[PDB]
């Protein structure tokens, strides 16, 4: 057919809009992939950002969480700097730094109640603390002369909001909760060692985890989603001992 | 988004044609001869690049591919760069002055069918013209390696003169 | 930066034994080179030592012939030198280095000043 | 506080399931950025796609619908070709291509009831018709020697999928609804001349 | 590809005068100088005219004094000549052009065959 | 995801040591010297390059 | 989300035996049959 239709799949029901306030703990590191060149050995075609998965848990109210998440970035910019034209010279295609412009996303998922509820949403709320995420150093293997180092890096996290993407495919939902952070530069200035750019505002891809397992970040959580729970109501007369 | 290079790269000591409104800059990785221009037609100019505290001396060059010679000396601390002018085939070779610092930089650019090059003594270095004839269609080879930097920009570009190659901090 | 550690020293009987060591960490010390030197009052430093890119390829100084000898641990990034039973004038410091030519463009400086400490 | 805490702020209401099924026509056009390199004019630093918008309208049993949408990639293919090294070359650091591996995202929206019931969701199927998108030809203005020219390219949209994305900020829910199509290349190939 | 097209054919009375135009599509044609040559039976072509990015000079060659002008226009990318009364050894097809001399390196053809048909 | 490509680059005619495991390949562009190896120790050698049909000189 | 039914009781209390027969497989088993009454217990059954 080529016109409008509607039909009704069901008749009505009941839905309550309950109000879960939780309270969160997610927890992230960073990925980043190298990727060399073909030649001597001293252009560097790629050091980008990449998805980075991980999972732990912790407590919260006693009820142990077991928590999941990806952490990824957007909006990043993509410097280049080429040290010399020669194939003994020293090159970095594109390297990823993150700035004001850039925002930064972690998917997060968890198997508790508040958490598995959040199918059918109102509004959801939240309010986190802002952490610094810092850059640690990186020795770029040179197989000649004194070896580039990549250094420093800081920049803040702030909150910007929350998505809910829900992926369909035949009926069945694949859905995905992502924290959407801000950013705000910091001191000290992030500078690549015997190289022309030095004191330069980000935090470069190279090693963001500096050393770390992981950036934390603590926070409140609220939800109002639509349960199915009934009232007690629409319940057979003899309901009870 | 992307963001430019903080320089435009050291290219290869190369022979061309660079357009106008475009400071080349330079810097040595050898003694003697740096760079040459010419139209070969009125207009023959080379410079040498000298370290400080050399005597008065005949030296030999392989200028203009028939090895030439001529005098260079210095006295100050700094490096000196004596350029070579000629003006017609046969003319005796001018040797014309200078250009001094410590940077090890030189610069030159064509505006106006006139010839702008640096010349003097860092910090205190500045720009001097030529003029010639026919002189977009000059050339310029080089035998160190070399920038480039479009004109808006004389603020900065004498200050890399003054003090180029932004720090290299180890 | 770029660092050379070195171990061994002291009081050494003459025509005893001991081992000395000279690793290296902030290069490749793989397309580098190596030598050995001895250091002294007046008479000057002087060539001890050679290996670059271990041909099966050495060669010694005068005075070092068969008393001393070499290993260049490219597993550990470093030379290791096996000492005995040579003359007083041994007393020195020893000292590991390499000095590289190769045409570096300009825009970084990919220069050494390559000398531990001894 | 570090403690669990519920309220309830609205007793039950009653909610009906519904299915809704129009025929839609999505149109989008493309965005490409090109930018210079500091220098002579010879290295083109970026040419890479950029998110497009474009807004219309049609009909649709004679209701006009005003649409709204915007078009971008995502796992684009980078292709970094270096003619020559010298001031005097041709070159381009950077140029974006896609691919099998790519995914090609265009949001879109409409203001009819049909679309404005889409904020809480149990289901969506769609089926597209398979179109195929060709390249035009740039001529790169190089102040020197023969004009590059870049020609040809040619991919195919199959239907991959659709999201359903609502960012959150203070009682207000901005939504947007994202087809996600899939490519598969065809002739002609493309080519810089 | 790389399009030169002219116009301005036709028969000339000698003691007269026309237009002749050489426009220019696939290059940049600032960067470029342009001349003309007149082609013929076995006398053989020669160099009419001179322009190389507007000095305010130019170059004009022995049977083309005067009663030729010429123009170079950048915005219209072209080359147009005013021709006017001149001896009848004009009869001949004449050809725009340039030949291009700078290094280019390898990878890529910067290379024309710089000729209109005329 | 980033793709390799095809060629290294046309780099320039420069001074250096090679290391192994690595096929250098050269394209002439004038007559004469295409290029020079060395140890400088026992080893000299380089290559001239001729167009075809050169008398013998 | 893996539903969850859980819960529910009863306690069979008995009221009267009578004769009845098994028809078993092999042969016709002569039996007794108690009739258990029934009674709600607490657990409230759910679908959870």
């Known amino acids: 057919a080529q016109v409008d239709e509607d039909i009704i799949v069901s008749k009505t029901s009941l839905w309550k809009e309950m109000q879960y306030n939780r309270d969160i703990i997610i927890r992230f590191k960073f990925g980043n992939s190298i990727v060399k060149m073909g030649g001597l050995g001293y252009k560097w075609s790629e050091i980008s950002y990449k998805a980075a998965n991980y999972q732990y848990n912790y407590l919260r109210d006693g009820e142990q969480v077991t928590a999941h998440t990806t952490c990824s970035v957007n909006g990043v910019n993509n410097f280049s700097y080429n040290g010399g034209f020669l194939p003994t010279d020293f090159g970095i295609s594109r390297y990823e730094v993150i700035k004001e412009n850039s925002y930064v996303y972690v998917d997060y998922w968890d198997d508790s109640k508040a958490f598995r509820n959040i199918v059918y949403v109102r509004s959801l709320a939240a309010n986190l603390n802002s952490v610094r995420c810092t850059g640690g150093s990186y020795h770029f293997s040179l197989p000649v002369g004194a070896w580039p180092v990549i250094n420093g890096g800081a920049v803040s996290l702030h909150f910007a909001g929350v998505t809910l993407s829900t992926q369909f495919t035949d009926f069945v939902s694949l859905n995905s909760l992502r924290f959407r952070f801000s950013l705000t530069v910091d001191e000290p200035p992030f500078s690549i060692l015997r190289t022309r750019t030095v004191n330069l505002y980000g935090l470069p891809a190279a090693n963001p985890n500096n050393g770390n397992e992981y950036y934390e970040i603590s926070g409140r959580f609220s939800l109002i989603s639509l349960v199915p729970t009934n009232d007690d109501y629409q319940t057979p007369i003899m309901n009870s001992v | 988004t992307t963001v430019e290079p903080i320089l435009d790269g050291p290219y290869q000591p190369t022979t061309f044609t660079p357009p106008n409104d475009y400071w080349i800059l330079i810097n040595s990785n050898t003694n003697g001869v740096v760079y040459e221009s010419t139209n070969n037609s009125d207009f023959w100019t080379a410079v040498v690049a000298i370290e400080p505290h050399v005597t008065p001396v005949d030296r030999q060059y392989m200028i203009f591919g028939e090895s030439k010679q001529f005098n260079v000396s210095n006295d100050s601390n700094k490096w000196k760069f004596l350029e070579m002018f000629r003006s017609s085939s046969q003319n005796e070779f001018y040797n014309r002055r200078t250009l001094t610092s410590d940077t090890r930089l030189v610069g030159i650019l064509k505006y106006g069918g006139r010839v702008w090059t640096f010349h003097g003594e860092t910090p205190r270095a500045t720009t001097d013209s030529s003029s010639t004839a026919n002189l977009n269609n000059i050339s310029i080879t080089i035998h160190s390696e070399f920038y480039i930097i479009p004109r808006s920009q004389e603020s900065k570009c004498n200050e890399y003169i003054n003090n180029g190659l932004p720090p290299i901090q180890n | 930066e770029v660092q050379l550690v070195e171990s061994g020293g002291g009081p050494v009987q003459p025509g005893g034994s001991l081992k000395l060591s000279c690793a290296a960490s902030?290069?490749?010390?793989?397309?580098?080179?190596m030598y050995w030197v001895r250091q002294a009052p007046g008479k000057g430093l002087e060539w001890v030592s050679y290996?670059?890119?271990?041909?099966?390829?050495?060669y010694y100084a005068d005075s070092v012939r068969g008393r001393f000898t070499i290993s260049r641990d490219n597993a550990k990034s470093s030379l290791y030198l096996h000492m005995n039973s040579l003359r007083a004038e041994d007393t020195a410091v020893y000292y590991c280095?390499?000095?590289?030519?190769?045409?570096?463009?300009?825009?970084?400086?990919?220069?050494?000043?390559?000398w531990g400490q001894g | 506080a570090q403690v669990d805490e519920d309220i309830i702020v609205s007793k039950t209401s009653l909610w009906k399931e519904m299915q809704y099924n129009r025929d839609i026509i999505i149109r989008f056009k493309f965005g490409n950025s090109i930018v210079k390199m500091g220098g002579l004019g010879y290295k083109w630093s970026e040419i890479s796609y950029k998110a497009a918008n474009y807004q219309y309208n049609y009909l649709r049993d004679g209701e006009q619908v005003t649409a709204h949408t915007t078009c971008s990639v995502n796992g684009v293919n980078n292709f970094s070709y270096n003619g020559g090294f010298l001031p005097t070359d041709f070159g381009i650091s950077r140029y974006e291509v896609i691919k099998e591996n790519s995914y090609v995202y265009v949001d879109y929206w409409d203001d009819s009831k049909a679309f404005r019931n889409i904020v809480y969701v149990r289901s969506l199927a769609a089926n597209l018709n398979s179109v195929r998108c060709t390249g035009g030809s740039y001529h790169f203005s190089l102040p020197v020697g023969a004009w590059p020219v870049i020609n040809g390219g040619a991919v195919s949209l199959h239907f991959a999928g659709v999201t359903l994305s609502t960012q959150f900020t203070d009682f207000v829910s901005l939504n947007s609804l994202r087809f996600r199509f899939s490519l598969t290349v065809d002739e002609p190939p493309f080519s810089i001349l | 590809e790389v399009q030169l097209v002219e116009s301005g054919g036709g028969p000339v009375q000698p003691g007269g005068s026309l237009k002749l135009s050489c426009?220019?599509?696939?290059?940049?044609?600032?960067?470029?100088?342009?001349?003309?040559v007149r082609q013929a039976p076995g006398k053989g072509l020669e160099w009419?005219?001179?322009?190389?990015?507007?000095?305010?000079?130019?170059?004009?060659?022995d049977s083309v004094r005067g009663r030729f002008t010429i123009s170079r226009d950048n915005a219209k990318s072209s080359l147009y000549l005013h021709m006017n009364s001149l001896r009848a050894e004009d009869t001949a097809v004449?050809?725009?052009?340039?030949?291009?001399?700078?290094?280019?390196?390898?990878?890529?053809?910067?290379?024309?065959?710089?000729?209109?048909?005329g | 995801t980033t793709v390799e490509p095809i060629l290294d680059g046309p780099y320039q005619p420069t001074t250096f040591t090679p290391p192994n495991d690595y096929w250098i390949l050269i394209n002439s562009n004038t007559n004469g010297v295409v290029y020079e190896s060395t140890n400088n120790s026992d080893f000299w050698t380089a290559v001239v390059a001729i167009e075809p049909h050169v008398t013998p000189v | 989300a893996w539903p969850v039914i859980n819960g529910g009781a009863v306690s069979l209390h008995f009221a009267g035996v009578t004769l009845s027969t098994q028809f078993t497989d092999f042969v016709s088993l002569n039996s007794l049959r108690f009739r258990f009454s029934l009674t709600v217990d607490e657990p409230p059954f759910s679908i959870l």
């Open positions: 280095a390499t000095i590289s030519h190769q045409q570096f463009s300009s825009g970084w400086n990919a220069w050494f000043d390559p």
């Open positions: 902030g290069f490749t010390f793989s397309n580098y080179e």
């Open positions: 290996i670059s890119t271990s041909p099966a390829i050495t």
